[PDB]
Paper text:
Neuropathologic, biochemical, genetic, and cryo-EM methods were used to study the gray and white matter from the frontal lobes of two individuals affected by multiple system tauopathy with presenile dementia (MSTD). Filaments were made of one or two protofilaments. When a filament was made by two protofilaments, these were identical. Densities corresponding to four asparagine (N) glycosylation sites (N145, N151, N164, and N183) were observed. By whole exome sequencing, it was determined that case #1 was heterozygous for a polymorphism at codon 134 (S134N) of TMEM106B. The encoded residue is inside the protofilament core; however, by cryo-EM, it was not possible to establish whether filaments contained serine or asparagine at position 134 of the core, due to the similarities in the electrodensity of the two residues.
pmcIn neurodegenerative diseases and aging, the microtubule-associated protein tau (MAPT) and the transmembrane lysosomal protein 106B (TMEM106B) become misfolded in different cell types and give rise to intracellular inclusions. TMEM106B aggregates, as discovered using cryo-EM, are composed of amyloid filaments that originate from the carboxy terminus of TMEM106B. The TMEM106B protofilament core spans residues 120–254 and consists of 17 β-strands. We also determined that TMEM106B amyloid filaments were identical in the gray and white matter.
Author numbering:
A (entry chain A), B (entry chain C), C (entry chain B): 120 to 254
The structure:
């Protein structure tokens, strides 16, 4: 939330990086570093806090009631045949793949019907995605 | 939220980077660094806070009621055949792929019907996406 | 939440990295480092806090009631045959794969119907994804 970074190869504060086939002969490197850091991140100062939720019923006549959740799946048909016919023939399959519904990252918070919150919520995702690499 | 960065290859504060086939002969590098940092990020100052939610019923007559969630899927048909017929023939498949519904990043917060919030919510996603690389 | 980083290869504070075939002959490296760090992360200061939830019924007549959860799956059919017919033929399959529903990361918090929160919730995911690599 404060210092989120994505670094590809190299990350450094003071780097005298050297690489292939070099001559580092008579250098006189000298440093003088002062790097004081002060974090006072999201400190609270609270006197009172109330989360109230009341449901009062009475003399109440209620018929059919349906409150369904935050994702319903109904009558979902996946209908993928795969028919191969081959008479006196030559076939060559490489990097052949058939994928159906598939997920890599699935993150859910506060997936309800009724919710009362107080706080600080984060979701951070850092990757190097590579699905198909055939060659 | 404050210092979000995406770095491709190299990230540094003071970098005397050297690369292929060089002559670093009589240099007299000298540094003098003062890098004081003060973070007071989202500090609160609160005397009172109330999250009130009331539902009062009474002498109330209610018929059919339906409150459905924040994503419904109904009668979704995926109908992808794949028929190959080959008589006395030559076939060559490489980097051949059939993909159906597929996700990589799925993040959800506060997916409800009724919600009362108080706070600080973030979603950060940093990647290097590469779906198909065949060659 | 404060210092989240994704580093590809190298991470360092002060790195005199050297690589292939080099001459590091008469250097006079010198350092002087002061790196005081002070973290006071999310310290609270609270006098009172109440999470109240009441449900009062009485003289109440209720018919059919259905409150279903935050994800229902109903009548989901996966119908993927795979028929191969081969008379007097040559077939070659390599890196051949058929995948059905599949997940790698599944994280859920506060997946309910009714929820009252107070606090600090995080989800962090860092990876190097590589699904198919055949070659
Ligand atoms: C630096 O090193 C070289 C070596 O080739 C030498 O000839 C030269 O006198 C040196 N000078 C100092 C100031 O160290
Ligand atoms: C290096 O930094 C310190 C920190 O204040 C300072 O007192 C000093 O004069 C600087 N130089 C040297 C040569 O030490
Ligand atoms: C608010 O400020 C600081 C905490 O950050 C503290 O010294 C002060 O007493 C707080 N005030 C109250 C009323 O709590
Ligand atoms: C709703 O309630 C009535 C009763 O008044 C009932 O006849 C009907 O079947 C209910 N609805 C469903 C979908 O069952
Ligand atoms: C720097 O190094 C070179 C080496 O080729 C030398 O001839 C020269 O006298 C040096 N000078 C100083 C100031 O160090
Ligand atoms: C380096 O920085 C410090 C910090 O204030 C300063 O006192 C000093 O004069 C600077 N120069 C040297 C040569 O130390
Ligand atoms: C608000 O300001 C600071 C906290 O940031 C604190 O010193 C002060 O007392 C706070 N005021 C009240 C009324 O809490
Ligand atoms: C709605 O309620 C009536 C009762 O008055 C019922 O006949 C009807 O079937 C209900 N609707 C559905 C879709 O069931
Ligand atoms: C540095 O090392 C070289 C070795 O080739 C030498 O000739 C030179 O006199 C040295 N100088 C110092 C200042 O150490
Ligand atoms: C190194 O840093 C310290 C820390 O303040 C300082 O007292 C000193 O003068 C600096 N230089 C040397 C040569 O020690
Ligand atoms: C709030 O500020 C600090 C804690 O961060 C503490 O010294 C002070 O007494 C706190 N105030 C109250 C009323 O608790
Ligand atoms: C709803 O309740 C009525 C009674 O009044 C009943 O006849 C009906 O079958 C119920 N609904 C379902 C779907 O069973």
């Amino acid at each position: 939330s404060i210092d989120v970074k994505y670094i590809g190869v190299k990350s450094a504060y003071v780097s005298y990086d050297v690489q292939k086939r070099t001559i580092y002969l008579n250098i006189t490197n000298t440093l003088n570093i002062t790097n004081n850091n002060y974090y006072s991140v999201e400190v609270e100062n609270i006197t009172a806090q109330v989360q109230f939720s009341k449901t009062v019923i009475g003399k109440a006549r209620l018929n059919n009631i349906t409150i369904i959740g935050p994702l319903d799946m109904k009558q979902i048909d996946y209908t993928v045949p795969t028919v191969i016919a081959e008479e006196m023939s030559y076939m060559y399959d490489f990097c052949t793949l058939i994928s159906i519904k598939v997920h890599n990252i699935v993150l859910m918070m506060q997936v309800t019907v009724t919710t009362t919150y107080f706080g600080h919520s984060e979701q951070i995702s850092q990757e190097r995605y590579q699905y198909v690499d055939c060659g």
